Design a binder for this molecule. Structure first.
Ligand SMILES: [Mg+2]
Ligand SMILES: [Zn+2]
Length: 195
């Protein structure tokens, strides 16, 4: 029960993490990363969803990161972009006075794997002489288990209706086409059968 910063995006996962963090700590603030798009539906939904439950939100533009993109160095993939996110989130946690850094990451990409988040935690700590603790509450949970959690927090429906998962700005049960939707839906259904 101290101060916590949640890397928030408004998706099923970061939202569940926030709800989670809200019950674990006294103070909880959020951070949303955008690539120069205060107007994006994702950044907006997130700000909405944040309001809905107190918690200050901080926006951060990470478009400078795109300098490292292949095209800019003369493909749009930039490796270890999660290193930077957690790096920044921890610089922020420092200023804002939080010791805890919640994130929805969960092993795919090497910088989403559990050992990387651990090495990263050590690094930020040495970088700033602060006992920072990075929490990855969804690390060993699958989609259906992520719903299961939300539900154990009593926010199943909140999450179901407000978060943005679809790859087309369509809130909740988006297009019902894209991967995201299928994965989110199959997870939901899988959790319902294990009712
Ligand atoms: Mg998310
Ligand atoms: Zn979709």
């Amino acid at each position: 029960k101290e101060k916590a910063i949640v890397v928030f995006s408004g998706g099923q996962d970061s939202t569940t993490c926030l709800l989670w963090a809200l019950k674990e700590f006294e103070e909880v603030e959020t951070v949303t990363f955008h690539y120069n798009q205060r107007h994006s539906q994702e950044v907006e939904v997130a700000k909405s969803i944040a309001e809905k439950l107190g918690v200050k939100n901080h926006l951060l533009d990470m478009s400078l990161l795109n300098q490292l993109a292949p095209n800019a160095l003369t493909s749009t993939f930039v490796p270890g972009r999660n290193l930077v996110f957690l790096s920044f989130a921890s610089i922020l946690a420092y200023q804002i006075g939080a010791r805890h850094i919640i994130t929805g990451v969960c092993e795919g990409y090497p910088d989403c794997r559990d050992e990387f988040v651990k090495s990263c935690n050590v690094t930020v700590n040495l970088a700033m002489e602060k006992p920072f603790v990075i929490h990855t509450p969804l690390m060993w949970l699958n989609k259906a288990e992520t719903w299961k959690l939300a539900d154990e927090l009593g926010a199943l429906d909140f999450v179901k209706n407000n978060t943005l998962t679809c790859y087309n700005g369509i809130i909740a049960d988006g297009c019902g086409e894209c991967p995201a939707c299928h994965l989110r839906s199959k997870g939901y259904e899988e959790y319902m059968v294990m009712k």
